[PDB]
Amino acid sequence: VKPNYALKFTLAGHTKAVSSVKFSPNGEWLASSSADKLIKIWGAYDGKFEKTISGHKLGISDVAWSSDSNLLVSASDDKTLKIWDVSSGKCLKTLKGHSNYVFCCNFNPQSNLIVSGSFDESVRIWDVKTGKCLKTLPAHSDPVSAVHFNRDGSLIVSSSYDGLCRIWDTASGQCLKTLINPPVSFVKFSPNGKYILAATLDNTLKLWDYSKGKCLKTYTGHKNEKYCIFANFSVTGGKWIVSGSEDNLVYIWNLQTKEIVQKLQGHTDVVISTACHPTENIIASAALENDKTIKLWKSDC
Ligand SMILES: Cc1cccc(C(=O)Nc2cc(-c3cccc4c3OCC4)ccc2N2CCN(C)CC2)c1
Known part of the structure; x- marks a missing residue:
């Protein structure tokens, strides 16, 4: 009926705002990115600091893991993405092509491709092996806030400050659907691929059937x-929607009822990123420059 997330660890180390936290697909690790130009790796279960990965020339808005947990990709203000070998910390490839800040990134499930979104209003699809840009999609008419592949890699969803969500055929780069005006600040596919969860900057999360163009659920508060x-x-337990908030809380809603089921308190600045562990009821959250910490929370359901 309600989860009981409680604070377990606070992970300090970043020297500026933390932008993104992601659990490795194997559940072992948490990666974080920061305005301090660094990626840090932490133990997912005990929060123990593992390593710092460095090389970007400016702050990093996003990091993402390959399916085998061996590679990371990062999106930076230095206009590049970088592919990293996690174990060695080495930069394997620098992905060059965007003409302004890179804000978001993801591997496809196959992990042979990376998708990126930029201030430059494009979505780019990159070859992991070569580091070359395969396609440049003229995706939006304002900054791209999020990019995500569906569970089989066949589709990409993008969101933008232009107020649109768009679904793209990965193979062809063709736009299959435009969902249509407040800025869209986040989007991702549901695990079953049928729905998209989208955030807009009027304090609203919406669960959409993008084929029908129908809003199924709205989460506010x-x-x-x-x-x-x-x-x-x-x-992993109850079916929840989880988000950060500008009031320094993590919000958790019941997905079906839309009721707030828990608010997690502890952060001292905007919680810009949350992540859910792949197998356990564990949440990671990260905050902006008044705070600079990552917190790990565990629930019984
Ligand atoms: C290095 C760093 C540290 C802390 C927060 C940020 C930030 O907020 N990122 C950002 C910014 C924008 C954005 C949109 C429109 C216009 C501008 C922007 O930045 C400068 C000018 C969009 C997305 C994003 N992110 C947030 C984190 N998320 C995991 C991926 C995307 C970055």
């Missing part, structure tokens, strides 16, 4: 009017 705040489907 949190504050989201300024920052591109990451949200999640929590699926």
Whole structure:
């Protein structure tokens, strides 16, 4: 009926705002990115600091893991993405092509491709092996806030400040659907691929059937009017929607009822990123520059 997330660890180390936290697909690790130009790796279960990965010339808005947990990709203000070998910390490839800040990134499930979104209003699809840009999609008419592949890699969803969500055929780069005006600050596919979860900067999360163009659920109560705040489907226990908020709380809703089921308190700045562990009822959350910490929370359901 309600989860009971409680604070377990606070992970300090970043020297500026933390932008993104992601659990490795194997459940072992948490990666974080920061305005401090660094990626840090932490133990998912005990929060123990593992390593710092460096090389970007400016702050990093996003990081993402390959399916085998061996590679990371990062999106930076230095206009590049970088592919990293996690074990060695080495930069394998620098992905060059965007003409302004890179804000978001993801591997496809296959992990042979990376998708990126930029201030430059494009979505780019990159070859992991070669580091070359395969396609440049003229995706939006304002900054791209989020990019995500569906569970089989066949589709990409993008969101933008232009107020649109768009679904793209990965293979061809063709736009299959435009969902249509407040800025769209976050989007991702549901695990079953049928729905998209989208955040808009009028303090609203919406669950959409994008084929029909029908809004199924609306989640409100949190504050989201300024920052591109990451949200999640929590699926390991109860079926929840999880998001950060500009009031320094993590919000958790019941997906079906739309009721707030828990608010997690502890952060001292905007919670810009949340992540849900792949197998356990564990949440990671990260905050902006008044705080600079990552917190790990555990629930019994
Ligand atoms: C290095 C760093 C540290 C802390 C927060 C940020 C930030 O907020 N990112 C950002 C910014 C924008 C954005 C949108 C429109 C216009 C501008 C922007 O930045 C400068 C000018 C969009 C998305 C994003 N992100 C947020 C984190 N998320 C995991 C991916 C995307 C970045």
